[PDB]
């Protein structure tokens with residue numbers, strides 16, 4: 001069509017596109033598979049079309065450095081729009097250009113290491129809540145789905161970190177916080193809706209004026225009113241909360257708005273609910289099929305934390321083998337699967353012309369399983385990140401949280417929240433592969449990096 005000849009005139013390889021659709025039909029196996037194939041059959045740089053949108057994939061570590069870090073503020077500043085957002089336009093992950101830079105500057109102190117030390121005790125409380133619910137699940141003698149026990153833990157952590165709501169989600173699934181935020185799941189960009197707007201981006205403004213938001217409107221309105229209630233109730237009571245830290249910044253760039261505060265509060269829930277639980281389920285599955293790693297980690301946890309001691313910020317950063325298990329699992333399963341930046345101007349990077357409007361993509365999943373930089377990439381060898389071998393890895397081929405000024409702002413929080421859970425559960429429980437567990441676990445063919453079947457494992461007291 002009009003823009004389907006852009007990659008041919010630049011001498012860039014890629015799958016031949018079909019009219020009105022581009023290469024969306026090649027998504028029959030999902031983004032992860034499709035990127036790995038195009039890597040094998042085209043080399044280091046290739047291109048494809050999401051409808052009429054040209055997407056350029058780069059794998060050179062220097063080019064990834066230029067896009068994500070070097071020329072970030074100048075050229076590659078924003079991600080591609082993904083649908084009708086409504087008032088959630090002010091979310092930091094959705095904000096663009098000057099709005100994003102202000103929001104990140106006014107929200108960066110919220111994710112300091114010092115503020116994280118102050119949040120460890122609160123996250124610790126629901127680690128003990130997790131084992132109690134896990135004790136009953138283990139005594140039943142039946143396999144346990146890890147997605148639900150971790151989702152309950154992640155929900156409990158989010159409600160206590162973002163707000164002052166202290167709830168046991170597993171046994172109290174009736175609080176309006178628990179019910180509405182339970183629907184804040186990841187986006188399957190290969191479902192009929194997101195596929196349709198990817199081929200029909202012209203329908204996004206139509207959806208917006210219909211007040212059709214990508215997020216559930218009932219959940220957003222409830223959470224906005226809840227913050228309005230809490231903001232008044234916190235004043236009447238006159239704290240360690242993502243909200244309170246934002247309140248303590250609003251009263252003292254230019255400023256942060258009341259609606260902006262609500263928007264960022266919801267995005268923290270959206271960025272943390274399933275992502276933490278999904279990675280936690282992935283981590284425990286890999287420990288069950290490789291008990292040697294599970295044994296050494298359990299021994300290391302007992303060494304740093306004798307007599308089932310409670311974890312502390314400093315002790316968590318001390319445990320090395322736990323950091324190795326988390327990193328290697330993220331290498332096998334980068335749940336973002338991709339990193340995207342929009343080229344706002346005509347620019348040349350590392351001797352390559354990038355015309356304005358092209359979406360530049362970094363295939364995180366494809367790079368993390370590339371035989372070039374990784375040895376036996378299909379295996380779970382957590383020793384790759386040993387202190388001696390933790391330098392050979394290129395920090396721009398392994399990008400689980402992204403890189404540059406637009407990386408995951410909650411990387412330290414997520415890593416601490418995940419590790420705090422892993423210490424408590426492993427030092428009390430051991431996990432064995434039940435029959436229903438798929439030993440060669442298969443990944444889903446949709447837009448999410450999730451297993452084909454929910455991971456079920458046998459759990460027992462230690």
Ligand code: HEM
Pocket residue numbers: 092093094104267268271272273275276279335336339340399400401402403404405406407408409410411413414415418
């Ligand atoms: C283990 C779970 C998580 C993983 C694997 C993950 C990964 C990522 C990735 C790959 C990005 C895109 C970075 C890039 O484009 O350069 C991102 C962005 C972001 N994440 Fe996370 N994330 C996780 C959890 C969280 C949590 C719990 C929070 C909230 C406390 C959070 C807050 C954010 C924000 C605010 C951004 C956008 C930052 C920006 O646009 O400037 N993430 N994350």
Ligand SMILES: O=C(Nc1ccccc1Cl)Nc1cc(C(F)(F)F)ccc1-n1ccnc1
Pocket residue numbers: 091093094186267270271272275335336337408
């Ligand atoms: O852009 C993303 N990539 C991603 C990261 C982790 C897991 C899965 C994915 Cl696909 N995720 C994202 C998107 C939004 C937006 F929909 F508002 F754009 C808001 C928050 C996050 N997010 C999740 C975890 N950390 C950040």
